[PDB]
Design a protein around this ligand. Sequence first.
Ligand SMILES: Clc1cc(Cl)c2[nH]nnc2c1
Length: 247
Amino acid sequence: PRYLKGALKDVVQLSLRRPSLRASRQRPIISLRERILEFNKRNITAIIAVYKRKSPSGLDVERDPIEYAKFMERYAVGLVILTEEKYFNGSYEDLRKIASSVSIPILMWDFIVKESQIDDAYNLGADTVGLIVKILTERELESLLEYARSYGMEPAIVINDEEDLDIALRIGARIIIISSRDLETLEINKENQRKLISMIPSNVVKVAASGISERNEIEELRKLGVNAFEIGSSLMRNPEKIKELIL
Ligand SMILES: Clc1cc(Cl)c2[nH]nnc2c1
């Protein structure tokens, strides 16, 4: 991993020790990237709902993962499921249960630093994973990206600054998540997010993440070329808000 400090250093060290599991995937890879493009073709708003019990940027929400996923199956373009345990109170059990239950694309959100986490995602039924430029070297990003591709996954590459974006383009990213939330400071900077969006080539699918709460925001971002919209805490507290946001 890169040179880190504080909680990011901690989460990375914990991820390195994350026990791997054994399971048989019994699910095709269903592409998140492709379904986003299809939603764009059909002029229907593509919202990726996040399932997360805890986060550094919210109060804890205890709710049933299956009930959540099955509700979102009707409305969301895909789901992101937290499997990081210490800071997000996720588990691979949430992923297994959700993947067995729904037929929409699933992205596993964790702090991926070793190949066995990708094995875990695959074996549990996730369609793809995020890779986080903030915590990985160029070399690690290229190796993990190729490894995920060997399972037929196309990882989303997660960025929040220019240096991160340049590395995402260097590795041949095809789908990028531009998060407005800095992982270290928890600052939301939407000016910076828009600037990053403007710099992504047109053939890369662009997902805007964090700070999205209104249909008017989604409309403005779509006009700037954003393809889909990742939304977490507000849906965790009020899942049916998604019906307003897609209207
Ligand atoms: Cl997989 C993943 C990872 C991080 Cl850090 C994210 N931040 N916002 N959306 C995300 C998805």
